[PDB]
Design an enzyme around this catalytic site. Structure first.
Site, PDB file in Angstrom:
ATOM      1  N   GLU A   1      -6.299  22.330   7.596  1.00 17.19           N
ATOM      2  CA  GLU A   1      -6.727  21.256   6.722  1.00 17.19           C
ATOM      3  C   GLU A   1      -7.473  21.785   5.507  1.00 17.19           C
ATOM      4  OE1 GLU A   1      -6.471  18.376   5.680  1.00 17.19           O
ATOM      5  OE2 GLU A   1      -5.458  17.153   7.197  1.00 17.19           O
TER       6      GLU A   1
ATOM      7  N   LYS B   1     -16.163   4.248  -0.996  1.00 17.35           N
ATOM      8  CA  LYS B   1     -14.940   4.981  -0.692  1.00 17.35           C
ATOM      9  C   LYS B   1     -14.869   6.281  -1.474  1.00 17.35           C
ATOM     10  CE  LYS B   1     -10.544   3.810  -1.705  1.00 17.35           C
ATOM     11  NZ  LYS B   1      -9.600   2.648  -1.710  1.00 17.35           N
TER      12      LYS B   1
ATOM     13  N   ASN C   1       0.828  -1.196   0.000  1.00 22.43           N
ATOM     14  CA  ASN C   1       0.000   0.000   0.000  1.00 22.43           C
ATOM     15  C   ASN C   1       0.868   1.254   0.000  1.00 22.43           C
ATOM     16  OD1 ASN C   1      -1.582   2.201   1.880  1.00 22.43           O
ATOM     17  ND2 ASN C   1      -2.940   1.116   0.455  1.00 22.43           N
ATOM     18  N   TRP C   2       0.572   2.169  -0.921  1.00 27.36           N
ATOM     19  CA  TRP C   2       1.174   3.496  -1.003  1.00 27.36           C
ATOM     20  C   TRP C   2       0.107   4.523  -0.643  1.00 27.36           C
ATOM     21  CZ3 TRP C   2       4.203   3.484  -6.328  1.00 27.36           C
ATOM     22  CH2 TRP C   2       5.226   2.524  -6.246  1.00 27.36           C
ATOM     23  N   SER C   3       0.344   5.342   0.392  1.00 25.65           N
ATOM     24  CA  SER C   3      -0.695   6.271   0.850  1.00 25.65           C
ATOM     25  C   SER C   3      -0.066   7.597   1.272  1.00 25.65           C
ATOM     26  CB  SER C   3      -1.496   5.678   2.010  1.00 25.65           C
ATOM     27  OG  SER C   3      -0.630   5.296   3.071  1.00 25.65           O
TER      28      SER C   3
ATOM     29  N   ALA D   1      -1.176   9.883   4.240  1.00 27.94           N
ATOM     30  CA  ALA D   1      -1.684  10.499   5.466  1.00 27.94           C
ATOM     31  C   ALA D   1      -0.687  11.504   6.054  1.00 27.94           C
ATOM     32  CB  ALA D   1      -2.002   9.419   6.497  1.00 27.94           C
ATOM     33  N   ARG D   2      -1.212  12.564   6.670  1.00 30.57           N
ATOM     34  CA  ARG D   2      -0.337  13.581   7.238  1.00 30.57           C
ATOM     35  C   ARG D   2       0.477  13.012   8.410  1.00 30.57           C
ATOM     36  NH1 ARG D   2      -5.440  16.650  10.134  1.00 30.57           N
ATOM     37  NH2 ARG D   2      -4.999  15.884  12.251  1.00 30.57           N
TER      38      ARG D   2
ATOM     39  N   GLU E   1      -1.651   0.013  -6.566  1.00 27.45           N
ATOM     40  CA  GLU E   1      -1.256   1.395  -6.851  1.00 27.45           C
ATOM     41  C   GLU E   1      -0.022   1.450  -7.734  1.00 27.45           C
ATOM     42  OE1 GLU E   1      -1.079   1.153  -3.023  1.00 27.45           O
ATOM     43  OE2 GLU E   1      -3.105   1.878  -2.580  1.00 27.45           O
TER      44      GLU E   1
ATOM     45  N   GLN F   1      -9.436   1.458   6.860  1.00 24.09           N
ATOM     46  CA  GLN F   1      -9.503   0.080   7.330  1.00 24.09           C
ATOM     47  C   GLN F   1      -8.538  -0.817   6.565  1.00 24.09           C
ATOM     48  OE1 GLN F   1      -9.797  -1.326  10.194  1.00 24.09           O
ATOM     49  NE2 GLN F   1     -11.694  -0.122  10.365  1.00 24.09           N
TER      50      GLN F   1
END
Lengths: 503, 501
Positions: free
Chosen positions: A285, A394, A170-172, A174-175, A236, A192
């Protein structure tokens, strides 16, 4: 004089912005404390060139410069979406509709898994630090907004997580904020699918030692896809390969088995713990606020190794009022997948877009009236059908209002959208509430309300299609210059404008 | 010195002095071309066009001034044309314009003063019954598929009872019908009986005197566009705004008094039994809806008077921004603020954003004053909507939006931000199902509600729930508001030194 490939190489991306006069090399000393963020905000909000801070207070020779506003907007003559187009290797003057359609086209191209290259070919391996040399607090990490909970090192990098299987990678995006000299905390495992990766390490007894990598300055196509809500089960990296036409070049981490983009500017390696937590946030944000609050515990990431290029560059995104990366990337990539969902479900939708002025909360759907009329349906039935399709996916998470407009509206032009919005729906009567669907945790009217603790509802579909447009042709005049008058008259007026006496 | 509020020609001079007027001496066609040229100018906030060479015009009848209250460049004062209608400095803000109008309501009204005909420019040329030929005038055909040529888009109707006790200055659209007649919906359904029966009570049911004036003192056309309370004299309020009486002269064929410096005066009589179809007309919401024609009483022109080189001011409504937004919208906002003050509501300012086509009314709420009410959003939205939708001020408004006092409601960038981020769709909107709908709203007129004309309005709460209790602190994440003033100044001071232009 090389052939530049800006989707593949972060440094080619910087070069093409240079060639297009879209990048300011700031050599004055700039303070990472607030000054960086304020300069980027000024630049975002006037659609000005991207700042490259080459002289940050407290930086070493190699750690680091900051590239701000990597997908901010710019002047229309250069191509106002040029920075986004460059993440995909497209012409700088490509329109946002063409960008979206190209992303959809790439879903049909051959997916290509990453290729391992020799470490001697991997710029990200130029310098390597072992654990005792990890000193996060000595980095010139920006403090981006007043009242942020800390210095947010991670706003435009890519988290890498993998099962012990190696079956799921998984490549994501998030801050992530710096906690102390050795630790980072962020929202990486909130979704999740990423928490399940984490759980699979707990099942082997490594719940406190889940390996991660965090990479900055990755191939621009990879940071874009990492910001996409692509369907579950689609890889991805392989979709990035499809966009590039070649495999992403990768090398193995120093301290774990994860593979990182070989041309990353910097790579941070370590482990995260599901038990050890630290308060995270707040952070300015995508909806334009820093809200003060008690703060929420988040998992702790321990950095155990680092590797980086000479004269490394940290790309930075400073979210807030429109328009920044949370609108041009997060919103438009939601719109891309919303168009895909429309096509797969058979809805008569020509295009989808998430206007920047609505802070990525509004999804506009441009409806093909011929297709709609063939359904022989009613606004109430169509609004239900549309909402049921989107608000349970999603793709629909961030969207709080879906707006249906006829095919005479250019949904990429907010002048036309706000006009159609105010003039074509009856307030309340033409909106259908969805009371039961998941709310978006970040939406300010959610987070500053009791709904922050029920997390249901507060969405609607708003019908901005005239009743007659559900049934048959409806010929009305749009009273502006370009649409209101005969094209030859518009031509004559434009041709004689200066002769009249105007500038 | 120049007095642009009192004198239409001084108004034109000041625009010329401010590089805000183009005199077009090329031949321009009143058929569509005038309208297209004005739309181009409105939509890029360009100088006002003064068409001096209309196809078919005579020496005196007429020139056209387009965009008399359009917007212009910010460095000139973007609301300067509106400011000049009131005699205010060209860089006056819209808030200051509104507050000046409000202060003038508390001033001694000043009635008109009759001046001699020899000193009335509007009497320079006089056409009697046998010389009325309306079809020879270069009246514009302003929008594609309009129902006819609209002479009356920026003039002033004058009507009066025989008592001279009821006087009305108003701005309904006026279509040319033929060589002698015009049509429009000048009398409102609340006055139709008193005027009919009062003129009928002397055997004149089909012969109600009217005058229609163009190029009136700009303060008068402004007041004529304002929904001031019933019973208030428009002329006397104009006098308070000017600080002096409006000079007037009597008509040739009736006893109505008209502004002495009018560019053109049309006079005659109205018949209620004789009607003609009027419209459609491209209007404030940006549409011509085709074939929509509705019967209106017939106006017979019996005399006309005008200046040398007379000028017809023209408004060409459509997409924002034109006079239906800068004048109609903002004057409803003005009266909305007055109603807030009179009803004791904690409202700092009111405005109708031009981008919302004068359908949205934003109310800037004093959070301290709100908190002193110790109320809830549901109660406060009910209280606000009940107050506004039972008045003539609320008629055109279909959505009232409540925001905190950190929002500059005159800047649509802040308004759309607050709108989308601070109200929960549907849940934070209170429908008003029984109040009168606005007949012209497209979502009304193009729906079954056009037959019922009730409802379809709402009050939308964009005040965070906690702001009803305390003004909690949050950071607004842009450049000017997000950072300390010292940092903002330093970044601006060093911008070019960084390498930016």
């Amino acid at each position: 004089m090389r052939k530049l490939n800006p989707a593949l190489e972060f440094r080619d991306f910087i070069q093409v912005l240079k060639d297009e006069d879209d990048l300011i090399e700031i050599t004055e000393e700039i303070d990472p404390n607030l000054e960086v963020g304020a300069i980027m905000r000024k630049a975002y909000e006037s659609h000005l060139p991207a700042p490259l801070f080459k002289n940050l207070k407290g930086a070493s020779k190699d750690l680091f410069s900051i590239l701000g506003c990597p997908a901010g907007l710019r002047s229309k003559e250069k191509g106002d979406h040029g920075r986004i187009a460059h993440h995909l290797g497209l012409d700088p003057k490509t329109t946002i509709k063409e960008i979206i359609d190209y992303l959809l086209e790439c879903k049909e191209k051959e997916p290509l898994p990453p290729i391992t290259v020799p470490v001697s070919s991997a710029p990200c391996k130029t310098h390597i630090l072992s654990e005792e040399k990890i000193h996060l607090q000595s980095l010139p990490t920006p403090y981006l907004h007043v009242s942020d909970g800390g210095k947010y090192l991670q706003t435009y990098g890519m988290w890498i997580l993998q099962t012990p299987d190696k079956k799921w990678t998984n490549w994501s995006i998030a801050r992530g904020m710096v906690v102390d000299d050795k630790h980072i905390t962020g929202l990486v495992i909130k979704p999740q699918h990423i928490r399940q990766i984490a759980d699979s390490w707990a099942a082997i007894g490594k719940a406190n030692e889940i390996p991660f990598a965090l990479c900055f300055g990755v191939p621009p196509a990879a940071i874009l896809v990492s910001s996409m809500p692509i369907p579950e089960g689609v890889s991805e990296s392989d979709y990035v390969g499809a966009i590039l036409g070649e495999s992403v070049p990768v090398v193995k981490c120093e301290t774990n088995d994860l593979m990182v983009p070989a041309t990353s500017e910097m790579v941070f390696e370590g482990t995260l713990s599901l038990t050890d937590t630290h308060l995270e946030g707040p952070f300015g944000e995508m909806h334009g606020y820093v809200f003060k609050s008690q703060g929420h515990p988040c998992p702790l990431y321990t950095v155990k190794a680092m590797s980086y290029r000479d004269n490394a560059i940290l790309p930075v995104s400073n979210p807030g009022l429109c328009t920044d990366e949370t609108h041009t990337l997060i919103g438009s990539l939601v719109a891309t997948e919303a168009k895909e969902l429309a096509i797969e479900s058979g809805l008569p939708i020509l295009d989808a877009f998430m206007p920047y002025e609505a802070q990525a909360l509004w999804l506009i759907l441009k409806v093909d009236l011929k297709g709609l009329q063939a359904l022989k349906t009613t606004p109430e039935e169509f609004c239900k059908k549309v909402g049921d399709i989107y608000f349970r996916t999603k793709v629909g998470v961030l969207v709080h209002e879906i707006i249906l407009v006829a095919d005479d509206i250019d949904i990429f032009n907010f002048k036309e959208v706000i006009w159609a919005y105010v003039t074509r729906h009856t307030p309340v009567a033409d909106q259908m509430a969805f009371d039961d669907v998941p709310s978006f945790v970040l939406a300010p009217f959610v987070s500053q309300s009791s709904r922050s603790k029920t997390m249901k509802g507060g969405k609607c579909v708003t019908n901005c299609i005239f009743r007659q447009q559900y049934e048959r042709s409806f010929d009305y005049i749009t009273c502006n210059f370009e649409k209101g008058y005969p094209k030859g008259l518009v031509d004559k007026v434009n041709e004689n404008w200066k002769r009249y006496g105007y500038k």
